[PDB]
């Protein structure tokens, strides 16, 4: 018998919200009778914009070649880069010969204020050379990014791909536990690259991350191994007409600074496991003498 709708108290504020009763009076004895778009044409982003009339687009206050702080407004009405020439023998012929030492770039310099400033986007023949690089929603570098009962564990310990059970690498225990005593159950997250099972206790993790960069299983090559120093950043993979190439002819003191496609300009060389075994024992021997 809570009965909340019966009592409303309309004489004062109502439902957290305030009504117009405070603004319904005007008797005081104090003075004693004496177009625009959501997105942008420069970076395709939403935010603060300046109103325009000659053009139907909107630009940011800090996305212009002569940028101006929003607090100090420009005098009059501001116009875009090409809006200046929008209202207004060819001028190219005299412009080419007007200046010296710029003749091959005269036409390129002519077209500077005839178009709007914009953020930089990589061309249509750069990103796609590496299949790992894909365009983002707003222009991000996309490489790998996208409290209940025990029922989390059956939803994670069974992938229904082959009707089997995934076992962790550090410990050979799935540890699904029992329904009566679920405290012995351990959550397992799988890898997003090789689907390697991993307990949440073996690797120092405490939560599942599903927004942002995908979790990496720590059984791969380091991305930024540090040894003044050296910052290895790989050489990526090339899918453009098999440009990466495969030339196995030496495999000895190769010194190919990593980046091997192991088999049983840029050049992802081919390596075998016999060579890896041989030069491992060679390095072990040379460490034994020193």
């Amino acid at each position: 018998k809570k009965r909340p709708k019966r009592l409303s108290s309309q004489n004062v504020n109502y439902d957290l919200k305030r009504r117009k009763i405070i603004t319904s009076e005007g008797i005081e004895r104090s003075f004693k009778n004496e177009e625009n778009e959501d997105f942008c044409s420069a970076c395709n982003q939403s935010g603060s914009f300046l109103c325009c009339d000659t053009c139907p687009k909107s630009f940011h206050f800090l996305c212009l070649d002569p940028p101006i702080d929003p607090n100090n407004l420009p005098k009059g009405d501001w116009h875009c880069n090409e809006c200046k020439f929008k209202i207004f023998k060819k001028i190219e012929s005299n412009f080419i010969k007007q200046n010296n030492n710029v003749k091959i770039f005269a036409k390129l310099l002519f077209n500077i204020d005839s178009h709007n400033p914009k953020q930089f986007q990589l061309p249509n023949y750069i990103k796609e050379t590496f299949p790992a690089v894909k365009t983002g929603s707003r222009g991000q570098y996309s490489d790998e990014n996208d409290t209940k009962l025990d029922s989390y564990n059956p939803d994670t310990h069974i992938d229904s791909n082959s009707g089997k059970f995934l076992i962790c690498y550090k410990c050979n225990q799935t540890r699904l536990g029992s329904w009566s005593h679920p405290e012995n159950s351990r959550l397992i997250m799988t890898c997003d690259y090789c689907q390697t099972p991993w307990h949440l206790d073996c690797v120092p993790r405490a939560s599942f991350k599903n927004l942002g960069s995908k979790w990496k299983c720590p059984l791969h090559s380091p991305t930024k191994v540090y040894k003044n120093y050296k910052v290895w950043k790989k050489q990526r993979l090339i899918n453009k007409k098999n440009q990466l190439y495969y030339e196995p002819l030496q495999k000895i003191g190769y010194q190919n600074n990593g980046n091997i496609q192991i088999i049983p300009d840029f050049k992802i060389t081919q390596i075998d496991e016999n060579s890896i075994k041989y030069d491992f024992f060679d390095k072990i021997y040379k460490s034994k003498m020193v």
Binding site: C194, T196, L219, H220, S221, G258, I260, I262, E273, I276, K277, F281, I284
Partner: peptide, 24 residues
């Protein structure tokens, strides 16, 4: 001896999805 590493790794890892990364 120092040549038992190969079949030790063959028994332990087994699958080539990780063994190749172990070789790397």
């Amino acid at each position: 001896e120092e040549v038992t590493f190969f079949e030790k790794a063959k028994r332990y890892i087994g699958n080539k999805h990780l063994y190749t990364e172990f070789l790397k």
